[PDB]
Amino acid sequence: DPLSETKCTLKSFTVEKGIYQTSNFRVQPTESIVRFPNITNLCPFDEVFNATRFASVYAWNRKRISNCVADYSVLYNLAPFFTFKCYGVSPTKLNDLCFTNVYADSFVIRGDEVRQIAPGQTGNIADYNYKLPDDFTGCVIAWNSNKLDSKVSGNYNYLYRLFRKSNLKPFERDISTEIYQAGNKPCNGVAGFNCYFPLRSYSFRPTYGVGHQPYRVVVLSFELLHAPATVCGPKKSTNLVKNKCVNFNFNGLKGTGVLTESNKKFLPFQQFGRDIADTTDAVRDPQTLEILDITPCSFGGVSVITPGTNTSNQVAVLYQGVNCTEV
């Protein structure tokens, strides 16, 4: 009670007659509001994942993605994408961490070659078709495509490099059709003895087992450079609440106060408003072009009026600078 608060403030068990200042009355916030502009200009991930035709694994398709918002929850929310292996970054924190550029590598492989798309792995795809660096920052996605890439007669439109003089560098594409030199004698462009064409055809069929069905694979290699990163995830926006002391996040700006309608006419470019005392007093909502005053939650100084405790223990409370309707 205020008498005991006064005793605590004065560090004494007896309070003499007079008026004493003890503490402050401040209203506390209850709701937190986070705001960002409309989630528009989506990255064209549909053209990459929902594409009707992919290229071969040796000629893997590379797509650069930037200057858009990338919704990684869409890829996380589709059931058919069974294989989601990611290395060097947590899949849960993909939505928040911002990077400069995206590289989407699309190709087609079989079952036994799915595991070869990983850092430190080896095989025909790793050596001659698609090489992944050891310090790879990104994810890989693989999904079954037996209903699309398989024919009863056979689909011969997909090819893989089976022979090469050396292993591919990371993120290197080899499309050369030069005859592989397997023997001492020069090939001279003829695939005769000890001379084989480096590319073989994947004869996908709908009657193959899980180890031989065609599987579409898209690899997202994510890079951050010295330039300002422009690939962001979708930023969730909390619904607006007004007329109450609330915590607000406006475009990364923290604050705590009552949001009220304002009569100020901000210029179209103008974003933040400051008062005489160099403090933020007005803000423009990032979604709806409206102005809002930010008033501090009710402030009061509490003073206690009491006679000497030798006389009586009754007290009175004076709230300084506070109207009687705000208590």
């Epitope: 009707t52 209903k147 699309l148 398989s150 024919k151 009863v152 007669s153 689909n155 709908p206 009657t207």
Partner: antibody, heavy 123, light 108 residues
């Protein structure tokens, strides 16, 4: 929401020839497979023919082998079917369905269909 | 070759009932079957592609299931705009895109 408009239907005598045209405008036609199927006036659906995105792989129904031919014009986003050596059993309804995939023989089936056109083969 | 059979041909139900249709195959097709709804007044439309994949844009009331030889489609709500014929088509065997017999559905 895609549009599939079919024409060329009518009544012809047995043994004559005609053309059916199916035009699409609501989607990209350069990378989709297309099919012609037959619904009898008193029976169920039956596949007839189909073409892939490019005129490389082509297939026909066994009962119509050596009689019907198909063509595809990607410039105007449409396809044509030539009706030759018609007999009494070709008086059914014909649809122009769009395959989900790009090849001719894939487990993926027809995605979007169009209103059938009525043809009659009688004197 | 491949043979497809439709156990039901014509069925009777009401608005607030539950109906089930089955399609059987002579040989297993690795669950590569598709269901088509054919209104008598307009062009037929697909409802279920594959074993148990629902085509986006149709109500989730229809449910496809079953693998191997016998497959099943199920309607739980029976809206009064479901007057059509249901076909099952296989896309795995050598006969290309062979369709089954019709299945009349009506309410009484």
């Amino acid at each position: 929401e895609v549009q599939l408009v079919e024409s060329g239907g009518g009544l012809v005598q047995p043994g004559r020839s005609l053309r059916l045209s199916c035009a699409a405008s609501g989607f990209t036609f350069d990378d989709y497979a297309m099919h012609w199927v037959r619904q009898a006036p008193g029976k169920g659906l039956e596949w007839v023919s189909g073409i892939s995105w490019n005129s490389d792989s082509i297939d026909y129904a066994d009962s119509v082998k050596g009689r019907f031919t198909i063509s595809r014009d990607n410039a105007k986003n449409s396809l044509y079917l030539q009706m030759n050596s018609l007999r009494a059993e070709d008086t059914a309804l014909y649809y122009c369905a769009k395959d989900r995939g790009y090849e001719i023989l894939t487990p993926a089936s027809f995605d979007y269909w169009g209103q059938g056109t009525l043809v009659t083969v009688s004197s | 070759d491949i043979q497809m059979t439709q156990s039901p041909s014509s069925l009777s139900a009401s608005v607030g009932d539950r109906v089930t249709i089955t399609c059987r195959a002579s040989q297993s097709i690795s669950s590569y079957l598709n269901w088509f709804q054919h209104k008598p007044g307009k062009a037929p439309k697909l409802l279920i592609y594959g074993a148990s994949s629902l085509q986006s844009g149709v109500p989730s009331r229809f449910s496809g299931s079953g693998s191997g030889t016998d497959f099943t489609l199920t309607i739980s709500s029976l809206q009064p705009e479901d007057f059509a014929t249901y076909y099952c088509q296989q896309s795995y065997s050598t006969p290309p895109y062979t369709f089954g017999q019709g299945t009349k559905l009506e309410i009484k």
